[PDB]
Amino acid sequence: YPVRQWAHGADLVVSQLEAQGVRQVFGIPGAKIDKVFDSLLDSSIRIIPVRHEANAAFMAAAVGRITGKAGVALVTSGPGCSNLITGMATANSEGDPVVALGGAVKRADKAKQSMDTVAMFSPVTKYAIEVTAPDALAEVVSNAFRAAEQGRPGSAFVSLPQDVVDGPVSGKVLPASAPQMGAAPDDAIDQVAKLIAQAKNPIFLLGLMASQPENSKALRRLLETSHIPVTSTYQAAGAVNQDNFSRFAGRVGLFNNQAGDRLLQLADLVICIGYSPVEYEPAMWNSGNATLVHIDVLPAYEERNYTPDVELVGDIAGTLNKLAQNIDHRLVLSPQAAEILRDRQHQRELLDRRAQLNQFALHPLRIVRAMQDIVNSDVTLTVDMGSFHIWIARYLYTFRARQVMISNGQQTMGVALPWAIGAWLVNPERKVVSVSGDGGFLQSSMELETAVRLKANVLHLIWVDNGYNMVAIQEEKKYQRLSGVEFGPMDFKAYAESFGAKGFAVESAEALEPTLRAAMDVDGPAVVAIPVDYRDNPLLMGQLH
Amino acid sequence: YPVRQWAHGADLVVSQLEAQGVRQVFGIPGAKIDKVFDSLLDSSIRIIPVRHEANAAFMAAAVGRITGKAGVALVTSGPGCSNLITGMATANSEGDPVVALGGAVKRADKAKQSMDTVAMFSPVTKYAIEVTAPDALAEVVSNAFRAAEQGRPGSAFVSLPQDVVDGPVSGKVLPASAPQMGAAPDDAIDQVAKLIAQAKNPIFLLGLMASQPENSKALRRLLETSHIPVTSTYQAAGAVNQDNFSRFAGRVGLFNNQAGDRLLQLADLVICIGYSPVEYEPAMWNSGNATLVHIDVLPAYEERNYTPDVELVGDIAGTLNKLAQNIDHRLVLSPQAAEILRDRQHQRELLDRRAQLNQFALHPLRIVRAMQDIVNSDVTLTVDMGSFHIWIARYLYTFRARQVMISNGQQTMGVALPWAIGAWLVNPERKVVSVSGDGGFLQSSMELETAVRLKANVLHLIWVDNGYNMVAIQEEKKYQRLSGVEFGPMDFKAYAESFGAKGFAVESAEALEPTLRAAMDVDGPAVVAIPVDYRDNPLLMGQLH
Amino acid sequence: PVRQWAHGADLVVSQLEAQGVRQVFGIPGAKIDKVFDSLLDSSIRIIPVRHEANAAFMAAAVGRITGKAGVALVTSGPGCSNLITGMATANSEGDPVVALGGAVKRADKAKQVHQSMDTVAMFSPVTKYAIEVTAPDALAEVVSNAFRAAEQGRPGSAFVSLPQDVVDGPVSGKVLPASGAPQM
Amino acid sequence: PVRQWAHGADLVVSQLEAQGVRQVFGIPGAKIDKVFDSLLDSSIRIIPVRHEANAAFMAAAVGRITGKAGVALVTSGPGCSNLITGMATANSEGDPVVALGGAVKRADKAKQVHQSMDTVAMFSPVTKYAIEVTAPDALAEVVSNAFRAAEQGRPGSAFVSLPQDVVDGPVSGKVLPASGAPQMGAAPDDAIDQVAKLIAQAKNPIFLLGLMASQPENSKALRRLLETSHIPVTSTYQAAGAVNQDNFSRFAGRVGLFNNQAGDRLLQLADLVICIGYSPVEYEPAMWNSGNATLVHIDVLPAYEERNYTPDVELVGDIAGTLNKLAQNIDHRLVLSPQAAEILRDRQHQRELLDRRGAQLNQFALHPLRIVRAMQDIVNSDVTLTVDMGSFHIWIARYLYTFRARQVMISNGQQTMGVALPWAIGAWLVNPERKVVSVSGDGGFLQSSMELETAVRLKANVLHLIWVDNGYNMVAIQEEKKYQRLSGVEFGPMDFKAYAESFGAKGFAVESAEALEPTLRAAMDVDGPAVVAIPVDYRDNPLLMGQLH
């Protein structure tokens, strides 16, 4: 990687992307950014045209979430960039590494009577810069990936003026390298080892970083050695499940009856791993009368309800591995602790028994049970935002997928389909299943063309209620009347077929399972519309905080 | 309108909207902003749920453009707001008065670990504020309309914290009132009257404000008295047409052979009305060797190529009316001027003759001729962005619609359909026709449900090329190869029918006209897909600057 | 008349002369010294102050009294930040003040590494007009527009950031005749 | 313990006490006076300044020296805006400073009418952390987070806007125990061993010290590693004080200003360069990185890579810990290659040439060399030295190898004038039993000299030296070199002796070369503030400027 004389800044950019291991770029071309698309033609990097920019950021996030390396979105100036904003804010919130390259007018026209995109992306990104110095082109791009991928991953934006990518530049490609950070200080680890030995009601609270694949082995090793109870936020939803750890206490942050919250309130020692208050309000679980231990790749983002007593900052896997070696005996649950886990066991049995639901439209439980049947350990499940989201979350313990993308702090609708297409591209040999409501569906359904064009093996399920139910039930609760949450019906079967995808519309309860199986069996894109009876939502909402 | 004690800030907001004459609100409800939707239930104001927030801003712009009073978009916090950005930037660029009310977290959580929407909307709006003082609720909203509607109209954003709209407030509704601004100084007008009498090659350059209905009569009165040649930017595209003024010289800013540019370069006196350099780069037409006169509702936004010699700021209609009374004789064209207008006449005859185009896919000219036939003086025509846009612009002189929405500085795709639905709502008894490419179509086609739900009498035409042609031809010209501009085919007939709208797909040249007529005859939403052969685009592009 | 200027600084000074500026208050520095140098070849008097804040205060008085904008001239970095309180006060009382502040070169690598302060962002909250010249040819108009924004309507302060390379390098353009106040 | 506070101001002060704050610099105003009032009921000393800018400068000195954030307290509006330059300078030099600024009430109608300035937006470009408290209950955490953001990682300044109603009104909440610095571990042992092996292999190794290497918590580790390894060292100015010629025989000078530094030649010669607490912003990598050597990066943060800065090995973690471990894997001291030895020999010769201990130098006005020599005679290991910005700065920087001071504050990337006196008062408050010497020109002196009143009031044992030329010389020489004529750089003379004594401080004016040493000696021995004006002849500055990059 020597210093070279590039014909166009665009060529250096593409080379830098290759150096980062980028395999594809999502986006829509425009006059200002077209030279980069053209440069990609001579690259091994695959160009993937989307139908709406927002979806390029969504697909990129899924790529970054799964691979640990930033997904890439490439858009043009003006509306090309403004259309990315929501997708970028969503990535940043979920900690998905994403790098967005946006076109811009020539540097000389910037002040001429040119959106100040940097000022627009700063609020929703970790890194937002505009290249005003041609010789720093590779620099800025390279540092965009570092910002997105390191520490708590997030989104990064880089504005590329047209003259800069079109004109000649000099420079070298910068090699890509997560730096060598070591485990937390051995003294600190020993300190925590003591606290554990002295604790009678210890518990682990897993955060985003605890769900990273680099910590999977160490985490397992730590849990298997101490057998200390575990609870997780939704960002760490997939870190541990009921099957691999009998002392799992569920996901915290949504329901008011979780064993995890009862254990946290009972704890005399809470050890948070890769956790940040933003994942689950500390005020919700921290009574303040328990020794608090913080373990993460970054210092604690302290709050009035999150002031650790012991902060361990450094390489998580290394830290946990050392901590595991400092534990001599598996925890003996206390009576109260034991009771709490027993309750969750009886609670699950109850949630399960709740039985011949053959009504039409379909009862949410019927749809969940059927979904769990088609979702297997080799399938990735992406979940949009809406009431169906709550139903699915309520039963996450019985879903056994390769992985689930559900965490959505911004509560952005329309994420499911693009996440799935993004996830499918990372492992094109596997099947992906995305589910959403009719509201979320129409916000990103244009990507079905992208899916057909890519032959993506994605199955999209639509819970059809003909409205924005999640909002409606909240209006009902507070006002006992609705407004702006009801819309007309649609024929999603023909809708999906129009794209060249396989469409299905469930017209009776007994047709559900057969319809899903036929749709699942399609080698390529498929959509199934499922009419749902949300009458019992009030009974589920009561289980919410 | 006395000071009152409101149960919820939301109630005061709704009252203020009624005071502004708001007839409907476009948007999507959310937890943070739901009380305002609920409050609208007891209002005469019609709630219109859209399928994507961006379209609420587009529809609102059309409303504001036609009525002179701000269209209204109502969205929730976070993604609800970020999804509005592009629509807002588009409104601001075209000078369409739009007020967007966005939800926000409770004031106390703003700093807690809440998008800084105000910072995100500032770059693309005239007015962007967040209500942090409950007692100023009506104030801020009222001033939002003033900012959007006055001077050079634009977009305005107001962030409404949840606690502010949910909690009780005190205040009064503020009455709505365009202040009493008078014509430019009589002395200045006389000065300009002299220049005119002394000019041998005078010409008018019309800008946005010259196309406002408040200036229609005065403008006509001024042109009819002096018979001085006229040319217009695309923002003032509808101010004057070939039919009502034989000395019309066309629209300037797109084609390199317009009589308007030749007349401007020949001018010894150029009088700009309601014009701003942003509408058409002064460098493109101002040689600098002609007396420049500026007439507008605001001082000139001077530039290196736009430094007026006489600036008349004040009420345009009044100013023009006085100027008309200071003209004693109709201009006698000079030989050169006369020649130039004669050329445009011969030019039009040529553009017309260019004749049995029965090929399939359809030739752009065939589609234009057919479009002009179905578009009559009672119909509003909205035009999206793409290659078809250029073809349509080339023949604007032969389109005779009630009005045309085509100006699009940002070159944002997907504007046509929502603009049409917005325009239809202003005059539901008339028909509206919107046209776009397949790329623009899928970016806002979700609103077809909104159209069906409203029974909007809108006919949407799609020029189908299976790609992003406007970008492709530019790539072709510069690189002689394409990238990211080609996508798969679709069955738009079934697509449109899935919404409950009437769908048609032209399968041969002879089917075109019959298909449009049947679609036009539908009392409600209808979509017609038209395969186009863009092979001759290179020959049209050559006529571009 | 469109002329060839050896330095953008000379065009800036000519524009100031067209505006009727009789003097300039400020403190020189490497980034903005070419403008002070060009001021030697003009009728405009250079008034060196001991602290930039006071340059803004003196300019505001000139503005309040003559109705025409007072002018402050400072270098980059602390030179600009030392003006902020002054600009806020002038804008607050409606006094027309135009401040010309130096800045690192446009392509300065320290620009992206944020080694230099975003003066436009800092001055925006306390001015009617704040902008950085990124196009040598837009020099005259921007300065001219700073005066218009400062003197017209409800008077206030205007800030213009001048990258070092832009004022030092050659430019093409003519002086924009100060139209002053539109005929309203 | 969650308590009920009558005022948010009381919680703020309690948090400050939890942070270990010993004093606060500032100027009170209506909006923030409740915090000053609450300060009366605490152990924290209120230090009123005469201009806010100087409150920030004094705070930065406290921060650089103690490593714990200095605190400035100002009122709303101009109170806050007068701090900006101060905050930019602290953030620029990596000094931990926390500023608490008042603001109108949250619901203030002037808020929306923009009658009040958006201070958060103004401070954002020049701080690591800038935020406004909009929730009374988030008061303690925000202040606490301001200190963390200011002291941790690469130190910097943090701004907190306190609406009047929030500090005046009651609040519920407990003081957040200052956790201080998280327990971060040293780099990975494997990474360290890989570097130890590179060191054992290198024929021409060298250490390049940056900001984080001069931090007090890394002082012991650095000393231990240099003594064990005996590897050459060069430092950027943000680390000018970490090592000096008199404490390490293989010191190669500071790099970034002069074009003939041994440090630059050794870096170019190096087959292994180990950067410690270094950031490319401290010194353009293009100037020294030839890509011919293996590059190791050691810091509390990964590197900000670039064309001329792509580390081959990155040791991220606790710098002190990493340096200690590395030192334990060094078998013996480096035997300088003959090339490196010659380079150090050359630096020795250049220092011999720069020296003038035997020259008469009795011209008047004084020659910069005579003043520099006189300054070296009064500054010793028990004295702190602060340097302002101007031509005298270049002269002092050239002779930093000759100043045996306890510590020196000179680094000033923004080149902000007026920093010396306030820096010295702050440095004095940290160690009131020691002497502090501050130096500036007439330009910078008059920008912060109002603080002379603050000095007398505190009986600050500070000696301020003024190089008098009656103009902005540093700018004048740049104009002369580029245009051969001057503009806006000349002003009138002043009676600085009388000026200083009008404050109640001891004033002196050197009227001849022979009087220089005796005067400085008499000034140094004065218990309290003293100001010495020294007429200087800058005619030879070109001879010095010719040594610049």
Ligand SMILES: CC1=C(CCOP(=O)(O)OP(=O)(O)O)S[C@@]2([C@H](C)O)Nc3nc(C)ncc3CN12
């Ligand atoms: C309208 C809405 C959601 C969608 C609900 O509808 P469906 O997707 O049909 O789901 P269902 O609840 O009807 O099954 S989530 C939701 C959420 C509650 O805040 N997410 C949103 N995302 C955007 C981009 N804009 C507005 C909102 C506000 N909320």
Ligand SMILES: CC1=C(CCOP(=O)(O)OP(=O)(O)O)S[C@@]2([C@H](C)O)Nc3nc(C)ncc3CN12
């Ligand atoms: C891709 C594209 C356009 C669309 C072209 O396709 P069709 O709408 O299918 O039209 P046609 O040209 O193929 O007929 S315009 C265009 C424009 C050229 O800049 N507008 C855009 N709008 C958004 C929101 N994002 C990116 C662009 C870049 N450009």
Ligand SMILES: CC1=C(CCOP(=O)(O)OP(=O)(O)O)S[C@@]2([C@H](C)O)Nc3nc(C)ncc3CN12
């Ligand atoms: C005028 C000036 C300096 C001062 C020079 O004068 P003296 O302090 O008298 O020193 P000397 O050089 O005359 O001895 S530094 C200097 C610097 C060269 O850029 N730092 C500044 N700091 C602020 C706050 N505003 C403007 C400048 C521009 N430069």
Ligand SMILES: [Mg+2]
């Ligand atoms: Mg729904």
Ligand SMILES: [Mg+2]
């Ligand atoms: Mg197309």
Ligand SMILES: [Mg+2]
């Ligand atoms: Mg001086």
